[model samples]
Target: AAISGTDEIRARAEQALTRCGVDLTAVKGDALTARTPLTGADLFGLRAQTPEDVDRAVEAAHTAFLTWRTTPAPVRGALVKRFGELLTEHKQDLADLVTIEAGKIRSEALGEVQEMIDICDFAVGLSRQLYGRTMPTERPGHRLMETWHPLGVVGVISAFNFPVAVWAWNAAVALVCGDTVVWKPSELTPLTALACAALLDLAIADAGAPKGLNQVVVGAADVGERLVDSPRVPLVSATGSTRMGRAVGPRVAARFGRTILELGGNNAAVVTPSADLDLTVNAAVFAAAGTAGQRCTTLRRLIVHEDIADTVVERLTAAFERLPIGDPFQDTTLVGPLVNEAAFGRMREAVERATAEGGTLCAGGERQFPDAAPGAYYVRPALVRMPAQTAVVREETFAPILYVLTYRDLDEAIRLNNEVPQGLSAGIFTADQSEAERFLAPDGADCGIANVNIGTSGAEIGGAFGGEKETGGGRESGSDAWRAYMRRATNTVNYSGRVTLAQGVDFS
Candidate 1:
């Protein structure tokens, strides 16, 4: 079955385009172009910021930060609360923008907006709870304490797969931490960024916050580089490929500025013989095929027990055959088009390399344009059974491709899962209690996120999100991820006149 209400969805998208406008000069430059992944048509154009524009944006954020840092943390959170309400108000429009610009399925599109709202709620509560600690001092009549303060302007660089959500993750937490933000969104998905900027402007106005408290720049790598290199932006929270992170991390470090880099993920899932075959098949299908396999946490590898490998592969292949691939706006369509032709080419290349390296193409790995708009690039989710962890399998291809390998035992399975360079997320399906605990142990799955009886995709907002190794050792969203957006200070006070030092030191 095809996607339902496809015409209506496109109409809404067109209406949004008309209402949102084509000119974006928030960060000045020549006009940069964007295309719709569903139709391959020029969707909109936004200016690529020049160096001067970056300077202006940074200056604006710095000015805002000077005043914002003095504001009370709870008061700062009140502004975040208003912003969250505004997000809920414009949820549909923003979600529609996500679908048209990023080609996410309607449900996933809405879910992304929901994530924005959830983080806003999280930030609102966090606003009141920027806690510090007290420490005991060894010296007589002395008291010591630790405190947290506002960080300066934060520089945010996001990826296309999660066009707006990642920015929300950084922006909300930064705002609550009494820090202003200067965002540089992915050039491929600028329209959604523009839409978010517009919505945030309304929120800022309603909250009576400073105008530059939250700023956005739409541009290419040069613009992002400028943000990273600027001294005005004390912290840079970036999300993209490991290559991008490598370039960003060191540059920011050289300046002694803080960086939170959320990079590439080559996640995996292990299926033991004791696993529920039905549960394993369901989780694998969604984890590998969701978002056309463009998510940072997409499950790219499947290591199955040899006894159940054939059965697991057969079930997954059957499920793949039933996935609905077409326009994302359609209700029945589960797999949508790749972001662009380049992604489509990468998917093709990865499959060819896998098969060339003595792997069997169990299902998919072909392009299809079923009832899609002209110029759309659609492909079936692919599954390949590899002889071993080939070099190709170690790399992350941002498309719906799954590589399967067989393991004789659980130890080998866990080892294969951790062998990849990217350590973002991993999962295991098993009924044995010891095996589940073992997977959660320190040596089990070296990924930042390890799960049992669940897929690697669909992380919650309450936990800290990020990964290790080449995945850029940065964290965002929940837990103490907010700490990354602030500075800490330790204080010691002597109540008595006499001065006494720790370790019985005497200098006077």
Candidate 2:
């Protein structure tokens, strides 16, 4: 497959951005270059925000919060509802931008955009349901209740792997909860961010919502740091590596701010003897290789029963070798190029390290057709058979390198799954009812998300998606995740005309 030239890439970007209502003349600056992984060419140059720009962005969001927090929850949802409508209308335009900036195949790119719309729908319904509880009070004529209020500006720091969907998870929920948002997307994928912000900005105007309800300040690490450090941003929801989390979690805490850290994952799946080999192999390949294994919940480790370990590895090796690698724009391409030469180098280095640590490269991991695109880094996914869980196996590598390990007993497999520092997502393929129950029990895999008969990736919008341990212990999207963007206030109404104390204490 031939890589498209910059002229073609830029033209495609212009079409998508323009259709999504982006003002190209205003959005672009020479401070940064937006490149596409599909062609390994610079798509165009865009502006980079400085630390000062972040302050202004956050201040604007804070000002918006004063108005947004008072807006009826349903009215706030109307804004997101409008945003959702815009997303649905411009789904293709945004998906095109995603494929251009993130190197996801067409289907996955579209799926990402769909995730955004799905969350918006969820947020819209949640608007009227930000429930408060009225509790029975022991004090006569006194009523006690807990109410939820907006937490102020939510600072979202997203990774390139899920440039827009992750932001939507935070933004839609935050907005519906009456909180303003300040997003700092990955420096790698700012164009999509620009177009998304623009679309949402239009939604605000269409809904007659307050301005600055959402803002995106895209640039380097310094820009993100400013957002994280700002006290105005009371809650910072960041999705990136554990190392990045380590820096963000403490910094936000130092400013007495809350943090939702969605970080790394060395996720694994437990294969039982009763597992369906046909179903397991297919599920394994996609979870391990989809998104080029750059997903936070990507199944990097596979713990198979010894009886099926060799057979599983052989099947996976075949699948990994055959995954289509080419331009993400092509409907046939299943796997796309690495984000850059640096990503390729990391994958190569990890593969080498695995081999040195008593691991066998079962198949793939070699660069495919380099002459096709001299600048692009295209390689087949790697399948490695490891004797034991080595150091390299424990580390979370953001590439399609799946490590296969053998386990004789289910207990051993569960331990092996939990031994890693990152515990984002885990799964087990089992036909036995007891096995599935035990995996979901208290003593099972120590992950935020656990599944049975399914792969580790591809979480639905209906559940709170995240992981525990080094995976950052943050929950985003669905469930009660909306609680994170808001603060709780316990109100007491003393209709008895007396000053009463709680817990039977006499303050008088």
Candidate 3:
């Protein structure tokens, strides 16, 4: 249970930052402190960009955009390709930064870095495929079509849970779409952002591209507010809690700006009588316990058919009890520390509330080795069997607290899954084809991502990753997600030298 001390932790961080070419001198300051969940102590002191500096940041991005927007999409793709290659080369270095700051296990940290590289690949291919449409016109000898153009500077505010990947999901596609990026990474994980920006800087320098294509501004809520309110940043993609979404969404909308708000997710997974219990339990445990349940797509609720409810819960409880909880740097350790003491407090409060609201705690949720890293919070993931979907179950507490609810019919199960204000990711584990199809039907799970026989935590870069409702109906990473970063224009050409309006209207 014992982990590295503050000095050792800072040493590891400095080494990784040095490997990734992060200029510690530039980030070192008295304004902000970069702390890690690994030890829940300051790793290094860093300066935060002043709220007033947001103006300069936006103007710089806009200035870069003026030139970037005119650059050919394929040429833009070359820059992302170079960045991805650099990411591939320094994968571990970046992962180390992710692990120390985000507190995810080494494997998951590396996987997040891979996600960044994969999206870079996805964006590179998509640059040549940011397709427009040609439409048939009613007027004689008239042609109509649509075109996509770079919008402007993009303002990205990412959460600590996905320190670097989320920015890559936004920046890679935005840059490939000919728009520049101005990022405000989460205050808790500034080191990861600086490392990522440095690699991108190396790539940009290699290509001799516009220097301001990407900028990382680290600070508090006021800094994010300035980015959101800036008219120069035409689109803002923010990832965090729903409360944060409520504040950010309207602020950007009020300025007639677009926003991709990736908010909270009280994601759930359904288990039917026909489910493969072996597969279901494994997927459920990982989905609920992975990332200490900090992922927006983490499985918070398990809706199981009553026939298999007890069996599944028993299996899950056994699995939860056996999870390897220790230092994230260790290869054998699976579960890492909670982000901080506040997160642990929230988890404890939610666990207590669950029992008070008629839940039976089956396994885990107890803090372990308090003296190991006195500042860090390490706890067992909890498994709670609830009689019904209570108020506590509906809330997203952002901890590894899995609440199991029983249902007789699939309708009730789907209802329970959709009952929460969040509509992120949900899954139904079953062998029955009809049941699987129904869960994925229009009236099934109302989440943006509905999977069959798989948990919600692991999403590939090939799909658009986001949620609906309070989770925010924004898409990123793949598909036509690049459209979010660009503006659209319709063109009507009069080859016959005639002017005509649609709907048989003769406006001219």
**For all candidates, what are the clash counts?**
1, 0, 0
Residue 145 displacement in candidate 1 (angstroms): 0.5
Give one digit per residue, the lDDT tens place, for model 2 in 403-428. 99999977889999999899889999
At residue 393, give the lDDT of candidate 1: 99
The better-scoring model by TM-score among 1 and 3 is: 3
Which 10-residue span in candidate 2 carries the lowest summed lDDT?
A: 499-508
Residue-by-residue lDDT tens digits, candidate 3, 162-251: 999999999999999999999999989999999999999999999879999999999988999989989788899999999998899999
Give Cα-based local distance difference scores for all models. 0.86, 0.90, 0.92
Clashing pairs in 3: none
TM-score of each: 0.95, 0.98, 0.98
Off by over 4 Å in 1: 1-11, 17-30, 370-374, 501-508
TM-score of 1: 0.95
Instruction: Between candidates 1 and 2, name the one with more favorable TM-score.
Output: 2
Candidate 2 wrong stretches, greater than 4 Å:
500-508
